[PDB]
Amino acid sequence: TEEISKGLEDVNIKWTRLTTIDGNKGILRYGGYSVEDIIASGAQDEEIQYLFLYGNLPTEQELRKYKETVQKGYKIPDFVINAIRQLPRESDAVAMQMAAVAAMAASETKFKWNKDTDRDVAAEMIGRMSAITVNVYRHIMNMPAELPKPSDSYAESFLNAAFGRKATKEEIDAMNTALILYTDHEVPASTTAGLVAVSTLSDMYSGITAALAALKGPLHGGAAEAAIAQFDEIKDPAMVEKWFNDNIINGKKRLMGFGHRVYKTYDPRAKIFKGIAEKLSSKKPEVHKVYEIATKLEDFGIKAFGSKGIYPNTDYFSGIVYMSIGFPLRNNIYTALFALSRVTGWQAHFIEYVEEQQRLIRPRAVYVGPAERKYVPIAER
Amino acid sequence: EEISKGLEDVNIKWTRLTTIDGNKGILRYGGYSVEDIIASGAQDEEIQYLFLYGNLPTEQELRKYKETVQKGYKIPDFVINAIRQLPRESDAVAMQMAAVAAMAASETKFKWNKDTDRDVAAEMIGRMSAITVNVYRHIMNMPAELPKPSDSYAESFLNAAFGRKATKEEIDAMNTALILYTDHEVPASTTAGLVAVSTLSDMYSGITAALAALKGPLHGGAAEAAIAQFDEIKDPAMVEKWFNDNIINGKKRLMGFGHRVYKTYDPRAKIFKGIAEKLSSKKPEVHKVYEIATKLEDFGIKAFGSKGIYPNTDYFSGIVYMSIGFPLRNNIYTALFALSRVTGWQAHFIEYVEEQQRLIRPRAVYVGPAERKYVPIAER
Ligand SMILES: CC(C)(COP(=O)(O)OP(=O)(O)OC[C@H]1O[C@@H](n2cnc3c(N)ncnc32)[C@H](O)[C@@H]1OP(=O)(O)O)[C@@H](O)C(=O)NCCC(=O)NCCSCC(=O)O
Numbered sequence: 061t062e063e064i065s066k067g068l069e070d071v072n073i074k075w076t077r078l079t080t081i082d083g084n085k086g087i088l089r090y091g092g093y094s095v096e097d098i099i100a101s102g103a104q105d106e107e108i109q110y111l112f113l114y115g116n117l118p119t120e121q122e123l124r125k126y127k128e129t130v131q132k133g134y135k136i137p138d139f140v141i142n143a144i145r146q147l148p149r150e151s152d153a154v155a156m157q158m159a160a161v162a163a164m165a166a167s168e169t170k171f172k173w174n175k176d177t178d179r180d181v182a183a184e185m186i187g188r189m190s191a192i193t194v195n196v197y198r199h200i201m202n203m204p205a206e207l208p209k210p211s212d213s214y215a216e217s218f219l220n221a222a223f224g225r226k227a228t229k230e231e232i233d234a235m236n237t238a239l240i241l242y243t244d245h246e247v248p249a250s251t252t253a254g255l256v257a258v259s260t261l262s263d264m265y266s267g268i269t270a271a272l273a274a275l276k277g278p279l280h281g282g283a284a285e286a287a288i289a290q291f292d293e294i295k296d297p298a299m300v301e302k303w304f305n306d307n308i309i310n311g312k313k314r315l316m317g318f319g320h321r322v323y324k325t326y327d328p329r330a331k332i333f334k335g336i337a338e339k340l341s342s343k344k345p346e347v348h349k350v351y352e353i354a355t356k357l358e359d360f361g362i363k364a365f366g367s368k369g370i371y372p373n374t375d376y377f378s379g380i381v382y383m384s385i386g387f388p389l390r391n392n393i394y395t396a397l398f399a400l401s402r403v404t405g406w407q408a409h410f411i412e413y414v415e416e417q418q419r420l421i422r423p424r425a426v427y428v429g430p431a432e433r434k435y436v437p438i439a440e441r
Numbered sequence: 442e443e444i445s446k447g448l449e450d451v452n453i454k455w456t457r458l459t460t461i462d463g464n465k466g467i468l469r470y471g472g473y474s475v476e477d478i479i480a481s482g483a484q485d486e487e488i489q490y491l492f493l494y495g496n497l498p499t500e501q502e503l504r505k506y507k508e509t510v511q512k513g514y515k516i517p518d519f520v521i522n523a524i525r526q527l528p529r530e531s532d533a534v535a536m537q538m539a540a541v542a543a544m545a546a547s548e549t550k551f552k553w554n555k556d557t558d559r560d561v562a563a564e565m566i567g568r569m570s571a572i573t574v575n576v577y578r579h580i581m582n583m584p585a586e587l588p589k590p591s592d593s594y595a596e597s598f599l600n601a602a603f604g605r606k607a608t609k610e611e612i613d614a615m616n617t618a619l620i621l622y623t624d625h626e627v628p629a630s631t632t633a634g635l636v637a638v639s640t641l642s643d644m645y646s647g648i649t650a651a652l653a654a655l656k657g658p659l660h661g662g663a664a665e666a667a668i669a670q671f672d673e674i675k676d677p678a679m680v681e682k683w684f685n686d687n688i689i690n691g692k693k694r695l696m697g698f699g700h701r702v703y704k705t706y707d708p709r710a711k712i713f714k715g716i717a718e719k720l721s722s723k724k725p726e727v728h729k730v731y732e733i734a735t736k737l738e739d740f741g742i743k744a745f746g747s748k749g750i751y752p753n754t755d756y757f758s759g760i761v762y763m764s765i766g767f768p769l770r771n772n773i774y775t776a777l778f779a780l781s782r783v784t785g786w787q788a789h790f791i792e793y794v795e796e797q798q799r800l801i802r803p804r805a806v807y808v809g810p811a812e813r814k815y816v817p818i819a820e821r
């Protein structure tokens with residue numbers, strides 16, 4: 061015992077029943093169901109949400125019961141809203157979500173880990189996350205506060221409150237795909253952070269807060285904004301080559317939206333996000349200009365990095381989808397919409413850890429510092 | 442290969458900061474044993490400096506350092522309000538989370554940088570003092586107050602928290618508690634924070650993640666859960682019955698006992714015990730809490746000492762905080778742990794990002810349902 065597991069690569073932190081990843085062939089499954097199959101069938105997010113908490117897809121009766129438990133989360137305390145609204149407007153959207161969930165971790169003095177109550181607490185929090193995100197977006201956009209109302213879909217309920225208008229069928233559907241696509245991804249940095257916290261037997265909301273803290277970072281969920289920021293920065297499609305050689309190839313910066321710890325091939329979610337990014341952006345000429353820079357850079361990226369197994373990830377196109385829906389490129393909002401979705405995966409993983417395989421997470425470090433030495437009083441230093 | 446349960450003996454990084462011999466019960470900060478530091482009467486700020494800069498400060502450097510820490514004694518009103526707008530019966534550590542979370546939001550200009558990192562951390566150490574003062578005050582239903590510059594960081598914290606002049610005994614006791622909780626290599630909290638910062642997320646979010654993990658009863662939460670056990674007992678005569686009914690029969694874990702690394706007496710516990718004795722003996726109601734604690738200790742060692750499970754740092758610290766004058770409620774004692782630990786947290790995050798940066802992303806073993814086609818809703 062003296063070897064460093066750099067980045068914890070290939071170290072198994074738990075067993076899971078929820079998500080499997082084929083990094084070589086680019087296969088992502090939720091509870092056995094492939095992410096392509098789920099979208100092809102045009103499934104609602106609530107069904108996938110239910111799948112992660114319970115283990116199988118819901119019957120008509122169970123789905124209707126599940127939605128009412130989620131919609132309970134649409135009503136949140138004033139201090140929770142205020143936790144967002146009393147922060148500087150120019151703040152990070154994910155950190156705003158962090159601040160709001162932290163308020164819940166504090167106020168929820170009666171939370172206890174229990175197999176009877178876990179899934180209900182989780183289901184309501186998924187609703188609370190929606191209510192939180194609406195108000196995060198509204199506060200940033202200088203708008204008055206609003207809560208999501210119950211409707212035909214979770215995606216619609218969210219979109220309606222966020223913009224303060226009726227969302228179109230096409231808008232609702234694209235958000236519904238994004239929510240499914242970002243639901244879970246086994247044990248990334250965010251989920252890991254949350255699992256470490258919950259391993260001490262701290263509460264669910266603390267786990268979500270620790271997860272959000274990690275997700276905020278540029279190498280993780282922060283790429284959801286940082287990738288599209290690259291597209292916004294190039295402006296002219298003919299400038300793409302120059303920008304790529306100037307920023308990435310000279311070794312200055314990493315290519316945002318590219319690369320993965322697991323996938324050595326094209327990201328499955330990146331396929332789906334691209335097709336939808338192509339469809340919706342082609343309806344808005346100024347957004348399509350972003351997409352046509354994106355695909356051009358994608359080609360230079362694939363050629364330059366493909367041999368090293370660096371391929372587009374789920375964050376490369378996702379931001380274009382959100383921009384097409386109506387959300388602006390500012391304040392890390394795209395990462396916050398990522399987080400809005402990933403809360404389901406995060407929570408399902410914490411429950412699976414505590415109920416069935418609980419143990420404190422506490423690694424070691426190899427000491428490489430100063431040898432044993434006598435303390436010297438400050439006077440003679 | 443398969444599951445590294447709890448990540449035991451898996452190395453996550455290298456460090457120059459802290460050494461632990463779990464078998465002998467040895468703890469060193471930058472090569473200085475914890476016993477050397479305490480015996481010397483070292484100021485907490487000296488040990489703060491040691492963690493941020495890699496060596497002990499000169500008198501000139503300590504003056505410069507204190508100036509930077511004190512900057513954090515002024516914090517924005519929304520950070521104070523991030524605390525005060527929450528229900529008073531809220532967990533104290535979770536209240537610290539909310540405050541630091543607000544900083545993570547507002548601090549939009551934070552960059553991981555060789556030239557700025559240490560000053561940011563020094564200022565945050567001060568800020569953690571401001572936060573904890575206000576966390577304690579709000580819980581007790583008192584007006585907001587900030588720490589003021591003085592001779593020592595501990596004095597500045599205690600004075601502001603209580604609103605009175607702290608006695609020399611109280612100041613030394615707090616100073617020692619601050620040193621003893623400064624760092625402990627890569628425990629759950631620090632790890633949770635390192636996972637966060639490996640995404641190149643900000644220092645404050647790193648602290649926030651660490652705070653979320655420190656709350657738990659298996660970790661820093663034991664700073665209150667241990668002393669809670671002594672409060673339940675009330676009568677030294679009923680120690681044996683409580684230990685027989687709850688631990689040996691009920692299977693509940695004895696809080697303030699055991700450790701991931703130490704398989705012997707925790708060096709910090711040993712020091713905390715001596716102070717708990719010195720401080721409690723003078724005030725009758727706290728003294729008998731100590732008397733319950735030491736009587737439960739003997740049953741603990743007789744039962745678990747052969748299994749490598751001995752008193753840890755949280756077992757006696759609660760009594761030490763109680764003697765200083767902090768009440769046994771709202772996980773205040775875990776919040777005081779945090780106030781200290783923020784120095785160790787930040788030192789590790791800087792160390793990891795500057796000199797050994799890589800994304801922390803482990804794997805899981807799949808035992809779930811095999812590949813299956815998306816079933817129609819009614820079959821099912
Ligand atoms: C996600 C990653 C951190 C994973 O990398 P990792 O598995 O930790 O390996 P690593 O960081 O040690 O990199 C290995 C090598 O590949 C190189 N590399 C990896 N990704 C990239 C990239 N996007 N652009 C340029 N070079 C890269 C890196 O420079 C290193 O080179 P060398 O061996 O010469 O030092 C990285 O691919 C990256 O930074 N990607 C860009 C940001 C991004 O899109 N992140 C989102 C990931 S997906 C979902 C999400 O989390 O939201």
Ligand SMILES: CC(C)(COP(=O)(O)OP(=O)(O)OC[C@H]1O[C@@H](n2cnc3c(N)ncnc32)[C@H](O)[C@@H]1OP(=O)(O)O)[C@@H](O)C(=O)NCCC(=O)NCCSCC(=O)O
Binds near residue numbers: 447659664694695698
């Ligand atoms: C700190 C610990 C989590 C470390 O344990 P670990 O290295 O994760 O080992 P583990 O949890 O897999 O347990 C191994 C065995 O020892 C037993 N064990 C460990 N600690 C205790 C205890 N305090 N009382 C009774 N049994 C114990 C445990 O029951 C298990 O036995 P079995 O296999 O028969 O169930 C544990 O000692 C514990 O739960 N302590 C009690 C709470 C506490 O005092 N925590 C604070 C630790 S120090 C400071 C701090 O973090 O702040």
Ligand SMILES: O=C([O-])CC(=O)C(=O)O
Binds near residue numbers: 244247321322374802
């Ligand atoms: O799997 C990872 O390492 C990160 C990722 O793509 C996600 O969490 O969506």
Ligand SMILES: O=C([O-])CC(=O)C(=O)O
Binds near residue numbers: 422627702753754
């Ligand atoms: O080292 C550990 O696992 C926990 C501990 O004693 C601390 O963080 O003070």
